[PDB]
Ligand binder design. Sequence first.
Ligand SMILES: O=C1Cc2cc(Nc3nc(Cl)ncc3F)ccc2N1
Ligand SMILES: O=C1Cc2cc(Nc3nc(Cl)ncc3F)ccc2N1
Ligand SMILES: [Cl-]
Ligand SMILES: [Cl-]
Lengths: 4, 4, 124, 124
Amino acid sequence: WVIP
Amino acid sequence: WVIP
Amino acid sequence: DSCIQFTRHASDVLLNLNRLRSRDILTDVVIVVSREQFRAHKTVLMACSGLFYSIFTDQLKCNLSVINLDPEINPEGFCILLDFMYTSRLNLREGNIMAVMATAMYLQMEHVVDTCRKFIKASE
Amino acid sequence: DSCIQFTRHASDVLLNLNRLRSRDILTDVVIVVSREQFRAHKTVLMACSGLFYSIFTDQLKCNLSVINLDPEINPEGFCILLDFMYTSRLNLREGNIMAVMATAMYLQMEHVVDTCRKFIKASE
Ligand SMILES: O=C1Cc2cc(Nc3nc(Cl)ncc3F)ccc2N1
Ligand SMILES: O=C1Cc2cc(Nc3nc(Cl)ncc3F)ccc2N1
Ligand SMILES: [Cl-]
Ligand SMILES: [Cl-]
């Protein structure tokens, strides 16, 4: 999961 | 396009 | 094999599937979550959820155009997860995380359940 | 928005859609390319091809379960492109590049047409  |  | 691969292809496919959903093109099922209705593509739901995979591989249920979820399921939690299925983006907030995690457990979306558990653990 | 994003989601969705195709689950169209038949999902074809997008948004053609392509289309070229749609991988070879490029121009798959043009230019 990432900060888009 | 890339070499997978 | 000796194939070449277009990096952005899968993301571009998903973006186009979400554009078809927006425009209600070739949607083939309505998911009912108490008083709310959500239109979607059975194939996208099956590709994202172990529960929908089990439902639409059943010889009788595969033919249904309406699926009613358990009354305990929160419509906002379902909406957030449906948007995630079609975009890869999850609108996880302090005010919705419990409903989102409960919905993802029911829908059998293991990666979502994983990030919810981690975010909850961080607040404790 | 303040969303989080699961990097592998789009790739995992496409992998599952290809598993449904393998297993002939919820395929809803047969594409005929002379003597050969290919089963697929209309939504995946529309998401990848400008030609299929135009076909399945047509109020009459959206209801067809069989689509016959132009007799000049090569079945192997179509097969290679159908595999690309479901996997992001293109089996481009000296022996098939002309048929693949011609098929991609017909199907309106601009990124494929682009890599074919570049590979052809490199050999000249
Ligand atoms: O957490 C999750 C997400 C998820 C999706 C699916 N989907 C499919 N699985 C297979 Cl093997 N082939 C085709 C599919 F559409 C099954 C189980 C699960 N569990
Ligand atoms: O080279 C290409 C690939 C391609 C795909 C599509 N697909 C869709 N386009 C839109 Cl805007 N919304 C939903 C779709 F399924 C249209 C044109 C083109 N041309
Ligand atoms: Cl997930
Ligand atoms: Cl393309």
